[PDB]
Amino acid sequence: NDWWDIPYPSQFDVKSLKTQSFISVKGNKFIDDKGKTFTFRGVNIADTGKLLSRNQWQKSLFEELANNWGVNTIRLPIHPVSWRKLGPDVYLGHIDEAVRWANDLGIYLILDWHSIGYLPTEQYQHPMYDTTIKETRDFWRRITFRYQNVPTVAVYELFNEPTTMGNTLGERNWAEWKTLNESLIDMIYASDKTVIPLVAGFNWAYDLSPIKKAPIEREGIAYAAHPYPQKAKPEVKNDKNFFKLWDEKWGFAADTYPVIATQLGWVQPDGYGAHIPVKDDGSYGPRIVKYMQKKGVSYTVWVFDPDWSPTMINDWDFTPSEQGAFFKQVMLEAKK
Amino acid sequence: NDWWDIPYPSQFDVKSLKTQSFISVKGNKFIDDKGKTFTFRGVNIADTGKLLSRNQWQKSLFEELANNWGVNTIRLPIHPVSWRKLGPDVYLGHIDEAVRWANDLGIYLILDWHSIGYLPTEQYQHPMYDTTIKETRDFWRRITFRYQNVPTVAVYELFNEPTTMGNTLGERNWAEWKTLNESLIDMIYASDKTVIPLVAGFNWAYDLSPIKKAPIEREGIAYAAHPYPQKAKPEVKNDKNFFKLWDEKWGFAADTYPVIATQLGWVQPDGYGAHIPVKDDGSYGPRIVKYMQKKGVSYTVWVFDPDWSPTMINDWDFTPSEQGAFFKQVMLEAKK
Amino acid sequence: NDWWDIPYPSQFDVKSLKTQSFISVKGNKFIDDKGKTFTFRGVNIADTGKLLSRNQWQKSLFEELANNWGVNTIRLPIHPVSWRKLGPDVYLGHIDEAVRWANDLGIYLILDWHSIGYLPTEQYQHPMYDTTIKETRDFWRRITFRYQNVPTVAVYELFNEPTTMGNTLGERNWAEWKTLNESLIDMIYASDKTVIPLVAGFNWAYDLSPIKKAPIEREGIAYAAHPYPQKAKPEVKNDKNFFKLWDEKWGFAADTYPVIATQLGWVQPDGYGAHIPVKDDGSYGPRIVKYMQKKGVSYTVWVFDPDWSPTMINDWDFTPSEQGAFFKQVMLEAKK
Numbered sequence A, B, C: 001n002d003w004w005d006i007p008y009p010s011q012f013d014v015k016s017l018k019t020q021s022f023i024s025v026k027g028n029k030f031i032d033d034k035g036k037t038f039t040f041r042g043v044n045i046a047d048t049g050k051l052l053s054r055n056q057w058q059k060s061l062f063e064e065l066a067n068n069w070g071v072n073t074i075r076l077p078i079h080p081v082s083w084r085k086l087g088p089d090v091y092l093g094h095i096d097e098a099v100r101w102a103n104d105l106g107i108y109l110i111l112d113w114h115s116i117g118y119l120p121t122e123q124y125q126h127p128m129y130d131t132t133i134k135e136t137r138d139f140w141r142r143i144t145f146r147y148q149n150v151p152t153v154a155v156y157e158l159f160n161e162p163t164t165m166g167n168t169l170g171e172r173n174w175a176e177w178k179t180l181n182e183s184l185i186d187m188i189y190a191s192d193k194t195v196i197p198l199v200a201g202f203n204w205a206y207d208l209s210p211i212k213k214a215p216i217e218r219e220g221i222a223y224a225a226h227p228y229p230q231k232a233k234p235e236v237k238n239d240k241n242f243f244k245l246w247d248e249k250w251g252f253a254a255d256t257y258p259v260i261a262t263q264l265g266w267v268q269p270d271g272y273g274a275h276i277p278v279k280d281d282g283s284y285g286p287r288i289v290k291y292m293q294k295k296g297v298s299y300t301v302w303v304f305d306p307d308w309s310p311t312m313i314n315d316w317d318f319t320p321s322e323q324g325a326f327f328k329q330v331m332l333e334a335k336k
């Protein structure tokens, strides 16, 4: 009841962590602070609140991924509805856990403000993604203060999937979206310059083409891409044609800036939770990996969860799904 | 509690309706899809929640209006406080009823986002009208999706009465208001191009004069006017002088665009709920009808409710008030 | 439950007050309506809700200040969290009391919308200060309507302390802040032109220098300054050097406009609640008073409360603190 006695916030204790290199942006690539080229390779897990509700929010989940799936990265998709439901303090308290767990295993975190829609009009694909410019600024202000000088937390993914859904959510406008991303970047950099902001384009984070002529005018950033199988629609389905379409929409970005494909994956058209644009016969697997390997692109597969689709696992014993078994072997081999 | 299992929204079932012509805009008039000129003539009823609270939300209300009062149109003034209080899902569920009832009787609906104030500053005449740009966009996004390809729902009245109340609510600015209406129109047209947006000017939807030089730059729209008796203030009270003042503020619009007078009416200065600007000795009745008949203007009288003023009815047995008896005979004769 | 029966607001009854001169702006000074030069000299008390919670919201508090401390002014720092917690109606009801108490004692009120942060981005130093542009407009709309033509309420301090905290809250931008203050001023002046708006600059209301080239383009305003001891940081701590630095940041304003230092004070570096920028050995006391007396600057010391720091009193028996005893004698002598 005494609002005047509500404490000012605290910062994560950097001394609680074991030594871990910082990742940074240099030209079109990520490097570690030993100067060696770095690639984020890993997975999304579900929202922290979803996992807590079935007691699945545990270090054992991070251990499974690091020890058996070859990941060096986990993406945490923080859904705004969950942020509000747990409340900032409780949610950050659990992010703290993820930081200690990831640090101990030598892996990195992407913190993703996981909304879908058009932030300038504050209209969204679904209420679970509902937010405001104000709440979005405040999330990043709180996150940047708390995790200042923390190497484990490597990437701040500002807004998961910008889309206007055919302009039903607003009129998509690059200038307006660019300015808003630059405004978030300035808030972040005023508080911690060692973090990497990750910026997304339109069409559910698929279309980076506006940066050919109007890139975000800030250094040290990377760009997101969500190249699901059915985004590119060539008439003849083969490597060359998919490669050319990927090149035009997002791939070109990797020539100049680092790119993280923070969501990608597939399930069979008659498989679990099959929906556009993630339906595929499986050939997309080797194709997207070949393309990303050629261009040096980083990635986090969606999703290491047995309820959310497309799944990487069929149960909480970690039985791999089709795409799970595929990506698991890709990541284990890349780690070698 | 499982926010991730909240369903995506559904659309009204168009097959549940009996055949009914669409109304559309052609030049300065409305036509039906048989190509015949159409005029909206009817009434406002009270907010859906108000009616539900005294069990007055019933098909029998629509039957009374269609069978005995000569209406082809009902305006539903959806008050934002009621939208929030029932919640969108429950409110839309009741709008669905109104659609089936209206369809069955061959009459049409105007859906009116019933706020009073200045949306660009989000300041209002009374808390019952309180809203935000965000909530307003979301209302229209939900409405347009749900009632796609539904002929019964003919008009989307974006914001009932713009006013700054002497600039106490903000600085009235046509450019800013025009742009915001165009932004709502684009959201709407991206989702359903068969609906007619209705746009209002300042001075509680009375002053359309800014459209002489700066009309909304979108096709297929109509303009609202709320020509209450005391809005025009001629020194000599007669047909000619009122006609000239109405001509300058709003009437001229009917030469180029269709106009719906979505609120109008009077009560005696010593009558029930008598207040500026609705006080009149009764001579306004024949005068506004003559003027509207001359210019082809559509209208919905305020209000077919015995509690809200000025009333068209004294009780829920539909005993006509002065203005009720007047307009009832006008509408019955026009129907012939 | 009947939202349609929620009453429209009422205005403070001016006939309940005893006769009291209005204060107004003329050039760089305040005058009373007898034409005599006026200086606001007094104190802040704590937020109304804080005082109510320990039954300290009482006329006896105002009597103590007027009869024994030589004040002609009390600043009420209305914290947005408290405004929401009591609710507008209950909060205004208590402001009404303050008005009657102050009027009876012949003293004046500064109503201060007591937030700290950057309103254009709606990001703040602490949640107790959290607000929005919408809530801020609405507060001033309600305040101006209610206290129309009330002499006792002399100053409307629009936003206590603008700051971006190193641009962690947003990019500080004078043009944007100037425009927003002008927008609030226009809402206020449309409703009551007899009140004095008080505008603040950046760096927690310390830096008025942008008004050298871009002053708020409205008449009848005054400017705020919060010249805490440690704001100016001369290497050699003496009158001349502090005076020059105060001159450059805020003092110059008093040559052209009236200035109220609505927050100032000190405590010993090892005293109660000692924090930057209020730590001082006591020499700031005579120095800031000399400077303000030279320039004709008005002031309200922070804070006449035994819990909030730096205190003017050690207990609710009004035992003076160091700064309390100092300012008490300054104000008693100035009153003579």
Ligand SMILES: OC[C@H]1O[C@@H](O[C@H]2[C@H](O)[C@@H](O)[C@H](O[C@H]3[C@H](O)[C@@H](O)[C@H](O[C@H]4[C@H](O)[C@@H](O)[C@H](O)O[C@@H]4CO)O[C@@H]3CO)O[C@@H]2CO)[C@H](O)[C@@H](O)[C@@H]1O
Pocket (backbone or CB within 6 Å): A161, A203, A204, A228, A230, A231, A232, A263, A273, A276, A277, A307, A308, A309, A310, B004
């Ligand atoms: O996290 C909660 C929830 O997530 C579910 O997965 C989401 C995905 O996170 C999201 O990327 C996906 O977005 C789809 C969208 O649904 C499609 O409608 C849209 O389709 C586009 C297509 O991309 C275009 O190429 C095509 O031409 O047009 C259509 C639009 O008509 O594509 C985007 C991605 O690009 O939505 C998913 C769910 O709807 C999980 O499945 C669920 O289990 C989780 O609980």
Ligand SMILES: OC[C@H]1O[C@@H](O[C@H]2[C@H](O)[C@@H](O)[C@H](O[C@H]3[C@H](O)[C@@H](O)[C@H](O[C@H]4[C@H](O)[C@@H](O)[C@H](O)O[C@@H]4CO)O[C@@H]3CO)O[C@@H]2CO)[C@H](O)[C@@H](O)[C@@H]1O
Pocket (backbone or CB within 6 Å): B161, B203, B204, B228, B230, B231, B232, B263, B273, B276, B277, B307, B308, B309, B310, C004
């Ligand atoms: O729906 C809830 C509630 O509605 C009540 O009716 C509302 C009307 O819906 C609304 O149009 C009306 O607005 C008035 C406003 O009150 C007047 O102050 C204003 O007066 C203007 C005038 O129009 C100008 O011409 C004149 O020069 O200046 C004055 C301003 O000083 O006029 C507008 C309409 O133009 O407000 C009504 C109630 O206040 C029902 O009466 C009630 O029963 C319902 O519950």
Ligand SMILES: OC[C@H]1O[C@@H](O[C@H]2[C@H](O)[C@@H](O)[C@H](O[C@H]3[C@H](O)[C@@H](O)[C@H](O[C@H]4[C@H](O)[C@@H](O)[C@H](O)O[C@@H]4CO)O[C@@H]3CO)O[C@@H]2CO)[C@H](O)[C@@H](O)[C@@H]1O
Pocket (backbone or CB within 6 Å): A004, C161, C203, C204, C228, C230, C231, C232, C263, C273, C276, C277, C307, C308, C309, C310
């Ligand atoms: O009302 C509730 C609460 O108030 C507390 O007092 C507040 C003051 O009202 C407020 O003015 C003060 O703001 C400080 C801020 O805390 C400092 O961080 C900041 O320091 C600046 C400095 O001013 C610059 O000159 C310097 O160069 O940089 C630093 C920034 O790093 O200075 C501002 C004022 O200028 O905050 C106080 C509390 O934090 C009461 O103390 C408390 O009891 C009440 O409950």
Ligand SMILES: [Cl-]
Pocket (backbone or CB within 6 Å): A162, A163, A164, A165, A166, A172, A202, A203, A204
């Ligand atoms: Cl898009």
Ligand SMILES: [Cl-]
Pocket (backbone or CB within 6 Å): B162, B163, B164, B165, B166, B172, B202, B203, B204
């Ligand atoms: Cl107006």
Ligand SMILES: [Cl-]
Pocket (backbone or CB within 6 Å): C162, C163, C164, C165, C166, C172, C202, C203, C204
């Ligand atoms: Cl600042």
Ligand SMILES: [Mg+2]
Pocket (backbone or CB within 6 Å): A147, A148, A149, A150, A151, A152, A153, A154, A194, A195
């Ligand atoms: Mg970091």
Ligand SMILES: [Mg+2]
Pocket (backbone or CB within 6 Å): B147, B148, B149, B150, B151, B152, B153, B154, B194, B195
């Ligand atoms: Mg329709």
Ligand SMILES: [Mg+2]
Pocket (backbone or CB within 6 Å): C147, C148, C149, C150, C151, C152, C153, C154, C194, C195
């Ligand atoms: Mg006053």
